[PDB]
Design a protein around this ligand. Sequence first.
Ligand SMILES: [Zn+2]
Lengths: 49, 94, 61, 364
Amino acid sequence: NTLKMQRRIAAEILKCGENRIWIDPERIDDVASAITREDIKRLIKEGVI
Amino acid sequence: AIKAGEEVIFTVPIKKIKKIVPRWKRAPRAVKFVREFVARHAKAQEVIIDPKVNEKIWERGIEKPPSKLRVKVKVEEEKREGEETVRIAYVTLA
Amino acid sequence: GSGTATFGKRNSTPTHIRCRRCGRVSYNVKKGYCAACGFGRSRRLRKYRWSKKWKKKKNAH
Amino acid sequence: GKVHRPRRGSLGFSPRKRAKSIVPRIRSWPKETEVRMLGFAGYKAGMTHILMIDDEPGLTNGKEIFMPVTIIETPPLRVFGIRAYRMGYLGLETATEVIVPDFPLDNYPAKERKGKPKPKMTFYKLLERRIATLPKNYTQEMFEQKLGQLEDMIKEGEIVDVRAIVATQPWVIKLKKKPEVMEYAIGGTSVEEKFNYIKEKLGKELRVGEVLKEGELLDVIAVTKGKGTQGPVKRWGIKLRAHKDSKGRRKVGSIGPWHPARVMWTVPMAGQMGFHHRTELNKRLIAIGENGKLKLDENTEIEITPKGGFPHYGIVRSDFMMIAGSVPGAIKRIIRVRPAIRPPKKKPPVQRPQITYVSVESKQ
RNA sequence: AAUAGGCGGCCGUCGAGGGCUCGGGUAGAAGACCCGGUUGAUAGGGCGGGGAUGUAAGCGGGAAGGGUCAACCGACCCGCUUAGUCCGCCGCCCCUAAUCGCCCGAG
RNA sequence: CCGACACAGGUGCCCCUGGGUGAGAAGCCUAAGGCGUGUCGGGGGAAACCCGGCCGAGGGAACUCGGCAAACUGGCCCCGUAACUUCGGGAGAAGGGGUGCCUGCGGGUGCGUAACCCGCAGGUCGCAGUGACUAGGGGGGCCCGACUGUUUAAUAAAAA
RNA sequence: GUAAGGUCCGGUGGAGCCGCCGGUAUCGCGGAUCCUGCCGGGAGUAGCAGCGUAGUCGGGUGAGAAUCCCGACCGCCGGAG
RNA sequence: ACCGAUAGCGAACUAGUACCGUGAGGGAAAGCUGAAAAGCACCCCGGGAGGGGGGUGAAAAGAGCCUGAAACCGGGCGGCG
Ligand SMILES: [Zn+2]
């Protein structure tokens, strides 16, 4: 469960570098469960990303 | 000795290892020395070092750890899995 | 020079490509003929009795 | 022709190996008529300097001169054994040895800690840290019988030498607790006289003042400071190779010719440097001080300890010696001294020289 | 030293003595060697001594001048200040760790 | 990708570059972007010796085939500048003085109290003011080839 | 049996083999820096440095974590990485 | 009266194949369980790979499979040490 796809898609969505993405260290299970761009957008709106 | 749920103040002499290691390994060597010193002086099987303490050690880069570090050691007992009882010492700044 | 550094300049157009007639990768692309069967240079096949490759093809040597 | 030069280093100190024991051994003793113990022991403390009116023959006689000195702390030794030597087939062989029975120890610096009374130390307890197997149920009567047997052997004449077995007392100066046990010869020409001299002081304390005389020459025996493994450049003083050498500069060039087809033992090589048994000759004993203090002119008394204490050493609290020049060994090393075995023909007078200044400034 | 030595002591016909482990260097490439181990000042810590640099931060005042010739800015200087910082040196104090444990061993 | 390789080479550095200092696409620091994969880790007064780097009292080439290597000088401004000469040069010849910070004025272009650049007076600190970084040592004879250029890819760059 | 070798005994093996006469032949190996295959000592040694010396703390996953993942700190490149 | 898997054609077999060279061209290694898969059901241990029991078979011949030589390596025994 490496969050490379999630980090890359979040960076692409937010229009920034991949090193500027912050992922909540307490919601790693939610981030790993998120597998689609819709789920990643939902996490971004929630504030995990 | 220190019993469970008790709190002590220690002064770790980090300068004891500056000249025995290369200048660019001094911060990790200081972290190792602090952990070993706390374990020996608290008779603790496990030591948990606070990220604040780690940042204080790494404040001036990998080459200049502080010569002396004042730390706060709290001793707790877990007794997990039945393998006797384990003593865990938590290290915080000041 | 003349060695390992020289071998790094093999990223240009290949000298030989696949031949439409004989099926081997021997077609001189720049000149326009096959170095194996002579396609593009002769109507007849390029066979030489000092060569054993065409015999090897059919196990006739 | 070729170019000649003396060889690098001396072959008279080979093998250059680590000393057999940290406690020095004495192989030869001076010949004297006075009945006294031929030497003493102490611990190296540090170095300082004085200004003194020279009394030795030479150009600078009668002029005030600078003089470096070394301070050796010498707490009194404990005389606790007597050994007898007979003449064997190939040399001296020990015939018997008698030690005194256990006695209470009163110079031990006992300290009251929280709970428990004074430890109340006794002998055979500090000595156990060195011998580890001491007599059990040993009594004064049995000691007297053993001494009488030794004396009877002396009267019969089977004994050709007698020596005193002494032990250091580092606990007096708080340096350590494990003592050093050494054997010392006694001057004179009568075995009976030497035996009486040892017997009258068996079980007692001997001070450097009762043994040595101020202003006399001594031989100093110790183990030099260790340097670890050192290359030939430092070990034998060879010349560095040419600066264009691409295989190194701190090494010997040729380690031998074609023939003999072996490396000769005389070729310098790297190895152990320092920590060697060495003897220094003709070191003058400038002065003897008592209780860490030195008197100058019957009204001035100074503390030999410099301000801030000796570097890597504590404070001198017992009797001490002032030796002109430097002595081998490190700080806190055990040093043995004996009367000079080959003194010069024109020796300096046997008395303390006129001292005008003693340095007690900080040495760190 | 193959004539492979002498002596004192302790042990055996459970057991003297020793090793690993522990705190440190008079020592050190690994081994080895040396001091200490509650029969305690070995290291840390606290206090004091001695030393090395050179007078800390903060505040008050002055400062060539400017500024509505006011408020205010200002390199730098003076006082608190032989200060501050630091010590691979020493002394005193058992507050902390030198604990627990394991192994070999002649008969 | 090619070189037998997750090869410090070559192909491709082929096209593009925020802020400060600075003449600068220089060096140094830093934003964005990227990385901790130019991928075996741990210990140590734990040596000798080797490779890379810093310093060294007095002397200053006495070393050596040979000043090899290293060292001196170094940016900018102002004075000053030889033999010889193909009159163009030599030439940055050589040699000498200055350089920081603060306070305040003057000048050029400019509508401007916008921006850039050039001077003046005073105060003051340190051993040292191009304080790090960047950054020539110089001169006099002789041989050869006029010069810029080319060469033995892999021991000769030269008077060829 | 001088010998080149022959034959028996005990064990493994599971399907072919031998004495004598007369013929026949790719008919006998220790070497050719011989050829092919397999295996030793070197050796649990060298190498895993040099031109960019980079990791630490807390948490997670997992039988198993210096090396995988998240956060913080500390670093490198930044007219090129 | 040829050879019997280093022999016989280079190829007894997915052989002019894999693979080497820009290119003409060059070119290997590799056969065998058992009569019958009857190719090991079930139990204990291990994260797994596997190990130990227990079964099939006249015989494990156990698929890493007919016989299993020599070199080499580990252990046991006899002798020296
Ligand atoms: Zn063709």
